[PDB]
Design a protein around this nucleic acid. Structure first.
Ligand code: MG
Ligand code: MG
Ligand code: MG
Ligand code: MG
Ligand code: MG
Ligand code: MG
Lengths: 88, 79, 132, 315, 195, 517, 85, 101, 49
DNA sequence: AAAAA
RNA sequence: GGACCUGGCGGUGCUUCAUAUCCCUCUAGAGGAGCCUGUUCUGUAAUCGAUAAACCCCGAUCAACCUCACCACCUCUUGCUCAGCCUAUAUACCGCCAUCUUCAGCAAACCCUGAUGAAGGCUACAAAGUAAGCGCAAGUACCCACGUAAAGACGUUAGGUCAAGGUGUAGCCCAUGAGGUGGCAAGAAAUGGGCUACAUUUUCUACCCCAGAAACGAUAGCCCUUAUGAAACUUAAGGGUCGAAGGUGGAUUUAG
């Protein structure tokens, strides 16, 4: 389409906790569990509003059920109405 | 994240500027200090709506106006 | 002697499948999970309600169909989707099967407030992998 | 059973055809590597076991090799050595014994008229699709070794090489760091290194004096302990390059000893660019050009610490 | 009672479109897929499961709906709802010199019918103060009134605003705060002489 | 609409209808069990709040009110209770959500209630007269409709088009040789509409055209005139009038098809491009046009129907199930009897494999088209589909499929025909039969197998009927050309015991085969 | 305390107690024995104790080319089927 | 049909604390205040003590929604320690795998 | 609100829409105990009987 | 201490 | 009573091994001091189970109030779920497990030898074992091919848990069930584990170890304050003066 992005991988975070195994005096035998949660974020650059909306629509229409989505858009803005030489 | 819950279509002046809801209170004193404190508390609260803030303000006003003997005996006047 | 959800071996007349003939220490190796959603990851809310809904759906599907489930249930939570991936034996009439499918779809869509579409997989007999 | 094999073969063929048709390619230029790549792409399996992967290669590789029937309709076995149980192994033994006798006869006639490893039991039973034991394997290996001692021609050479594999590479020589020039930079090279969570990067400079710059400042202010100074002087003393190099390093993360070891390893790896290979081999055989895998092992539950357990009372 | 029907494996052809068979992300139905793919851990002397009744092929999401030609057609059919990027905003320098105000957004996702997210209310306003009309006393007073919400290296004003459930209200509040900051910088009070 | 698993695929129209009815019954019982316990489906957890996730209420919400309580009891044993409450609390029943509800639920009771409301309350007269006419149109009443029309005309108000349409329908329903009466009624209606300053609607014109077509056999001119007048009013005409005109012209147009072509052109001009929703039977005209094109072997009308079916807007393509199946069968027969074999195969792949199974005439036509173009290989699946969709013509279909191979000789690569004949014979034997057995024996003898032919002959010889003359001669020749006249002797005995015509000749042939061979 | 109703086989195994330590040492007598019978056998899909006619389960669906109205059984037929059970 | 009483008492207390929340919030706000005379704080304490029990977030006991266990209950999925491992070994919690390091 | 789920399961078991094997086993055990000769007494009879 | 048209 | 087979045992014999095991031996700990938390006991109306290798900051990752399955006082009988018991039984179970077990056999179906007895079937320069599955290996993950983690059966302990959660038997359902207030959590004496110290290898000013100085530390007890709670009686911390006993522990033990 004409976006030109890159590829990178943030560090992963794995959570591990220790719980009991039985219901009575059985503390010397513990069973632990993990929580693998990787991270794969892109970097969309040089995109307008309609193109970004179309890309988000295409991403959401084929988004699997095993992953997530964190949209962080940074819009542009010239100058507000009161920033030049305003006196209240 | 704004489809449905739009805070009844309000702006920022109704959430930040809450001075237009304090009329039956003085200007310099501990009562005004407590009112400013509760106003600052309700201002930085993105969990409640402005209607609930006004309800709490009027309830506190009625509670302070009900027990007037203690405020009169506290060596100060209540407006 | 630590025994989990595995099947105890006795002689040679227990037709077990691939789900019942595996230990929980091989889930992320030679098995997998039945359901899949984003509630379990770190940093996300709404998980206890999802687990309660899942266990209630499993109990309902096991109680409504007497022995028609050859294995378990494979649920997929995709935003506002609840896809059921179950198997039904080839022992009854297809008309009753479609009737039950429609009834379950309507009940789930009207109870969980979510569009639900069922996808069945007809199996001629009980699923079996080994004679453990 | 053979009909099922043919059905699997034709199913694999039609699947390859349909895959080459849907991938926009050609059915003739769609090799097995492309098949494996398309299977791995279209089926994103999320498991750790390699045997639990979508495998759809050749049908004869997945399905076990069915042993053909050695007797026809009349009931007579095909091979002469069948009433035993181990037909292929004993046939090979008889053939190799006949070859040994022929070699002995040829050697007697000549006297009168005057890198790679062998096979294993697993490979043997996978090649001859016949289960055996260990004593027969040892007997066969000893017979082959006795055959290798005596003389043999090219025919016997290729005969004994047919049952011979090949060892892997054994060249463990070090790598010479290339001399990099960046805006007039003679005698310039970089390297890395890690020891017990400590990333360090050393920059070797030959046209200097005799000091090390650590994060801009010298190494005395950052390493007040004599142990770090000794660990930094050990490589310079082992190469006889004390007051001749003004190297610089940049380490981040870890304690004093960890960062010192990381800087030492980085400098040892960087000094392999302005010296011959004999000296770096001498360094490697003396404990220098090698990594330290002494990482703190995880703690075990139900104990006091890693290997220390609770006071287990007996009475 | 009992019957039998042939599957779609021997019923379809070869020169047939693929996205027309599996449009939406179907949970892989062993019927219209003529690919006898086997996945699972086999035994020492045996054959693992094929495609029918395979729990591994049912749990793992299949990616057969994203056909390359289908992806190309979908990307080409969406060209009508696109806007070309202007050539005057290609380099980052011109973008910073023209539009030096950046407004971030926080949009996450939740599993289930729940749409509200308590972490989707923060909108940090990043405005570079290297392009505004700031003199000496005004800039010093602005820095003093800000405190630690201003970077001394990149010179980017970072102010965290989150005092309402919505986002446009927080944006307007941040704009009003910046306006009051710019107004007070040009004013001198009675206690400013005793600095 | 159904599933995709192979075991639950719809093989015919009966399975599809059964699955659809089961789904509808499941939805109905689900809605019923939800309305029975409304206190178990109210705790919402969603956020956008779907409006289709709340059950409807049928109990009243007002007790001390009058008109509001009556409206809540009527709209939201209910109509009678609402009427009793309105009569007790003195509530004037309006013309909306009252008379129409009483006419739809309960038709002497609705007429009595309307008369009581008109005698006890005198509000709007035009709407009341229109409601009375609409209620009497379904109860056969001409005097009441005339009185309502007179009251609406004398009430100094604009007469509704619904009452006029109902009166015209009631007047032209039981018409006995009425030619100029319909024209006079149309002229009177046009004069009344011009005097009252109102234009005619499309529904009234469609109803008038249907009533005119449902009387005489050659009354397509009034329907065409009504359709033209409805189309010239400003909007598109209704498809019901065009369908009625086509049905009336197809009955009397047995010699010429000019009227049918004109009706098809009018239907295409009124509704051919965008499927505009403005009639009650939009697919009937398309089905009639497709049937006319299949009967007259037309290539333009069929193409127009295929283009206006589901190529742009699937609305007038299929109104139900039987009509859709008939249209598909007609299209398949036309494609098989018009072009060669490619178009027939395309139609069979896009209709017989996408909708449902075939019937009897369409299956016979497809078999004839396949036999005329050498395509005898997939006859077993067609026979199985015909037997599943119909247990009456299955034997006829099997006989027609086996006759294509029971008369030819033995070739080299003609095993598909023999396999199809064997499958048809097995399906006919395992169903619930002298001609079928004879045809199966002839096919087995003409195939090439000896054991199969002998088994077929032995099975057909016990059906109280021997084989034909050619089959007996072939069996005698095969027995004499094999050093075994046992088969010839058995055939002669079966022909002499079953009292057949071949007796002396069969005996002479058996004697010759026993003496020489 | 609600989500605890497991499968029927689990309840039968817990009630019969045939996988205990008393069956391998002769601790119990052969007379004391609890048999097992099939409970889910003569119950059609959609069999209730009130009497609701199901067109897609109980009564046939297509009745001579028509659809049967969803009705409800009375009390005499309910008593009849209870006596039959 | 339920069989336990402590779970029912706990859910009743949770409901009563959810209903009685604004008054308790106002009383707690009037409490922690260095300003304002002590008489108002005393009468607020008397009013909050005169209220009936079984209506306070202090009595909230984090139990399980399947077993109603008092102690040893996770606050994430709102369940005990045995049901968690049970449904993890069965295979309902995606991602929650046995720790193998 | 577990009471709503319990009532829903009960009304689905009563109408035959849910086959609860546990409650059926409980009812069978209660019937066997009542047939054995040890049933539940009436309302206001037992200790003073 | 024998086997739900 | 005579004879044969298996298991356990022999302070029963020969040979080879134990890599933290036995010392000749190395390091760190309990048993000697104080506190806290478990057993039992003391008067009381004040809970239950565990109570030898395989159990003790045990069920509990919380006994101030619900969390008290304990008691006393005031009441109720659709008594609150078309029911139920937090009454008694693991010597009725499912389910979650423990040392043996830091391993190498358990082992469906046949053949041979004990004249066809309980039983046994080993010898590769070979005198009767091939054999479905289970167990190790084979495998996943961390820094691989080391190592670690994770797995590790048939059975023993009528082993722990009917008080993870459901269920079997006896009794009640005008009660052992339920609604409100208070108390049982204080020490005559026996006891496991954890924490704090036993000097010049200690501590203070600052400093993350180039200085200067003092020939080591607080349990508990008194008062006040801070954050939360409806109430501070012990739970968290800090401030103010005072502050036990201890200049390295004997029979008896653990880990590396
Ligand atoms: Mg274990
Ligand atoms: Mg009690
Ligand atoms: Mg016991
Ligand atoms: Mg292990
Ligand atoms: Mg292993
Ligand atoms: Mg015990």
């Amino acid at each position: 389409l004409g976006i030109s992005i890159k590829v990178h991988e943030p560090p992963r975070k794995i959570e591990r906790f220790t719980l009991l195994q039985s219901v009575h005096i059985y503390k010397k035998h513990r069973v632990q569990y993990e929580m693998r949660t990787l991270y794969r974020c892109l970097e969309l650059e040089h995109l307008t509003g309609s193109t970004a909306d179309v890309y988000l629509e295409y991403i959401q229409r084929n988004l699997p059920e095993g992953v997530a989505m964190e949209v962080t858009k940074t819009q542009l803005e010239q100058l507000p109405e009161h920033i030049k030489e305003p006196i209240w | 994240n704004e489809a449905g819950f739009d805070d009844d279509g309000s702006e920022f002046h109704e959430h930040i500027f809450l001075e237009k809801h304090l009329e039956s209170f003085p200007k310099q004193g501990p009562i005004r200090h407590f009112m400013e404190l509760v106003t600052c508390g309700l201002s930085k609260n993105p969990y409640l709506s402005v209607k609930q803030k006004v309800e709490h303000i009027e309830w506190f006003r009625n509670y302070f106006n009900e027990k007037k003997d203690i405020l009169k005996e506290s060596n100060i006047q209540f407006n | 002697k630590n025994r989990a959800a595995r099947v105890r071996v006795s002689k040679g007349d227990k037709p077990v499948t691939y789900e019942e003939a595996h230990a929980p220490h091989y889930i992320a190796h030679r098995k997998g999970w039945l359901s899949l959603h984003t509630g379990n990851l770190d940093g996300e809310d709404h998980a206890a309600e999802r687990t309660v809904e899942d266990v209630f759906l499993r109990k309902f599907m096991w109680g409504t169909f007497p022995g028609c489930l050859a294995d378990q249930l494979v649920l997929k939570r995709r935003g506002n989707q609840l896809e059921i991936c179950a198997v039904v034996l080839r022992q009854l009439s297809p008309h009753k099967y479609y009737f039950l499918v429609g009834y379950s779809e309507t009940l789930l869509s009207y109870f969980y407030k979510c569009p639900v579409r069922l996808h069945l997989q007809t199996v001629p007999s009980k699923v079996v992998y080994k004679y453990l | 059973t053979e009909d099922f094999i043919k059905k699997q073969i034709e199913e694999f063929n039609i699947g390859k055809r349909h895959l080459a048709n849907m991938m926009g390619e050609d059915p003739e230029t769609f090799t097995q590597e492309d098949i494996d790549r398309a299977i791995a792409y279209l089926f994103p399996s999320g498991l750790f076991e390699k045997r639990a992967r979508p495998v759809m290669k050749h049908p004869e590789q997945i399905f076990p090799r069915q042993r053909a029937i050695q007797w026809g309709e009349d009931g007579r076995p095909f091979h002469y050595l069948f009433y035993t149980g181990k037909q292929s192994y004993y046939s090979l033994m008889h053939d190799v014994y006949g070859m040994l006798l022929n070699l002995e006869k040829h050697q007697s006639h000549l006297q009168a008229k005057s890198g790679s490893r062998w096979l294993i039991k697993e490979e043997l039973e996978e090649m001859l699709v016949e289960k055996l034991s260990d004593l027969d394997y040892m007997q066969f290996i000893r017979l082959l070794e006795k055959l290798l001692t005596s003389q043999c021609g090219a025919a016997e050479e290729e005969f004994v090489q047919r049952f011979r594999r090949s060892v892997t590479l054994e060249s463990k020589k070090q790598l010479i760091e290339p001399v990099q020039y960046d805006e007039q930079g003679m005698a310039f090279s970089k390297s890395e290194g890690k020891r017990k969570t400590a990333k360090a990067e050393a920059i070797v400079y030959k046209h200097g004096s005799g000091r090390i710059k650590v994060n801009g400042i010298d190494y005395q202010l950052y390493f007040p302990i004599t142990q770090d100074r000794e660990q930094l002087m050990f490589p310079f003393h082992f190469v006889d390059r004390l007051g001749k190099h003004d190297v610089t390093c940049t380490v981040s993360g870890g304690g004093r000893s960890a960062q010192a070891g990381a800087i030492r390893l980085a400098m040892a790896k960087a000094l392999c660019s302005f010296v011959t290979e004999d000296e770096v081999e001498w360094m490697r055989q003396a404990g220098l050009l090698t990594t330290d895998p002494r990482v703190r092992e995880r703690k075990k539950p139900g104990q006091e610490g890693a290997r220390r357990k609770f006071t287990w009372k007996k009475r | 009672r009992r019957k039998a029907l042939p599957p779609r494996t021997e019923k379809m052809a070869v020169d047939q479109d693929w996205p027309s068979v599996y449009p939406v992300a179907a949970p892989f139905k062993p019927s219209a897929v003529p690919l006898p793919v086997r996945m699972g851990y086999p035994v020492k002397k045996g054959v693992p499961m094929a495609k029918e009744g395979n729990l591994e092929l049912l749990k793992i999401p299949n990616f057969l709906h994203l056909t390359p030609v289908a992806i190309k057609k979908h990307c080409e059919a969406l060209k009508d709802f696109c806007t070309e990027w202007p050539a005057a905003l290609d380099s980052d320098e011109k973008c910073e010199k023209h539009f030096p105000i950046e407004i971030d957004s926080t949009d996450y996702v939740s599993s289930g019918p729940s749409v509200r997210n308590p972490r989707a209310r923060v909108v940090v306003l990043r405005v570079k103060l290297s392009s505004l009309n700031l003199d000496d006393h005004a800039k010093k007073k602005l820095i003093k009134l800000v405190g630690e919400r201003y970077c001394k290296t990149t010179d980017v004003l970072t102010i965290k605003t989150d005092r309402c459930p919505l986002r446009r209200q927080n944006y307007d509040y941040a704009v009003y705060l910046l306006t009051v900051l710019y107004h007070e910088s040009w004013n001198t009070e009675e206690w400013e002489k005793s600095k | 609409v159904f599933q995709d698993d192979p075991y639950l695929m719809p093989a015919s129209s009966l399975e599809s209808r059964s699955f659809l009815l089961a789904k509808k019954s499941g939805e109905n019982v689900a809605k019923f069990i939800i309305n029975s316990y409304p206190k178990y489906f109210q705790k919402d957890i969603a956020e956008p709040h779907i409006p289709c996730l709340m059950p409807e209420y049928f109990e009243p919400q007002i007790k001390d009110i009058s008109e509001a309580a009556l409206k809540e009891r009527i709209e939201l044993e209910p109509s009678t209770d609402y009427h009793f409450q309105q009569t007790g609390q003195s509530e004037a029943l309006e013309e909306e959500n009252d008379e129409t509800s009483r006419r739809k639920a309960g038709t002497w009771r609705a007429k009595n209630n309307a008369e009581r409301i008109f005698s006890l309350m005198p509000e709007k007269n035009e709407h009341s007269y229109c409601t009375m006419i609409r209620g009497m149109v379904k109860h056969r009443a001409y005097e009441q409709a005339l009185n309502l029309y007179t009251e609406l005309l004398n009430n100094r108000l604009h007469a509704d088009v619904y009452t006029f349409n109902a009166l015209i329908e009631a007047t032209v329903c039981a018409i006995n040789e009425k030619f100029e009466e319909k024209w006079s009624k149309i002229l009177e209606l046009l004069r009344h509409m011009v005097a009252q300053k109102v234009k005619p609607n499309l529904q009234t014109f469609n109803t008038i055209l249907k009533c005119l077509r449902r009387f005489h056999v050659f009354a397509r001119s009034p329907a065409l005139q009504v359709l033209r007048e409805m189309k010239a009013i400003g909007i598109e005409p209704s498809l019901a009038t065009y369908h009625h005109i086509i049905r009336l012209f197809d009955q009397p147009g047995d010699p010429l098809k000019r009227s049918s072509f004109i009706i098809y052109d009018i239907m295409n001009e009124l509704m051919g491009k965008r499927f505009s929703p403005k009639d009650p039977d939009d697919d009937k005209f398309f089905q009639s046009a497709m049937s006319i094109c299949s009967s007259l072997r037309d290539l333009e009308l069929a193409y127009q129907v295929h283009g206006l079916l589901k190529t742009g807007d699937n609305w007038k393509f299929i109104g139900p199930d039987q009509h859709r199946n008939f249209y598909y069968s007609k299209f398949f027969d036309l494609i098989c009897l018009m072009e060669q074999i490619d178009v027939t195969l395309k139609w069979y792949e896009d209709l017989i494999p996408s909708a449902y199974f075939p019937h009897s005439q369409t299956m016979i036509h497809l078999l004839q088209a396949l036999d005329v173009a050498n395509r005898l290989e997939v006859i077993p699946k067609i026979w199985k589909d015909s037997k599943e969709y119909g247990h009456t013509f299955r034997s006829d279909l099997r006989e027609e499929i086996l006759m294509l191979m029971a008369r030819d000789k033995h070739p080299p690569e003609l095993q598909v025909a023999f396999a199809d004949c064997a499958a048809d014979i097995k399906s006919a034997y395992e169903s619930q039969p002298a001609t079928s057995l004879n045809c199966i024996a002839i096919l087995f003898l003409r195939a090439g197998r000896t054991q199969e032919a002998w088994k077929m002959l032995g099975l057909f010889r016990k059906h109280n009927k021997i084989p034909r003359s050619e089959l007996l001669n072939e069996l005698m020749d095969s027995a004499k050309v094999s050093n075994s006249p046992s088969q010839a002797i058995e055939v002669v005995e079966l022909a002499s015991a079953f009292s057949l015509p071949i007796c002396e000749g069969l005996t002479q042939r058996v004697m010759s085969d026993f003496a020489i061979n | 305390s609600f989500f605890t109703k497991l499968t029927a086989d689990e309840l039968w195994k817990g009630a019969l107690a045939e996988t205990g330590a008393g069956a391998k040492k002769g601790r119990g007598k052969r007379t004391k024995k609890k048999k097992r019978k099939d409970l889910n056998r003569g119950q059609i899909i959609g069999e209730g104790r009130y009497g609701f006619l199901w067109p897609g389960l109980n009564v046939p669906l297509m009745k001579n080319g028509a659809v049967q109205t969803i009705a409800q059984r009375s009390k005499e037929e309910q008593e009849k089927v209870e006596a039959d059970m | 049909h339920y069989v336990d009483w402590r779970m029912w008492r706990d859910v009743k207390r949770r409901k009563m604390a959810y209903e009685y929340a604004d008054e308790r919030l106002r009383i707690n706000s009037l409490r922690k205040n260095t300003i304002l005379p002590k008489i108002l704080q005393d009468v607020a304490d008397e009013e909050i003590a005169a209220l009936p029990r079984d209506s306070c977030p202090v009595r909230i006991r984090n139990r399980c929604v399947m077993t109603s266990r008092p102690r040893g209950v996770k606050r994430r999925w709102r369940l005990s320690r045995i049901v968690f491992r049970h449904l993890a070994d069965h295979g309902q919690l995606s991602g929650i795998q046995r720790a193998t390091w | 609100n577990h009471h709503t789920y319990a009532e829903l399961m009960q009304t689905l078991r009563f109408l035959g829409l849910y086959r609860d094997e546990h409650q059926d086993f409980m009812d069978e055990q209660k019937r066997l105990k009542k047939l054995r000769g040890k049933e539940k007494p009436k309302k206001g009879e037992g200790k003073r009987a």
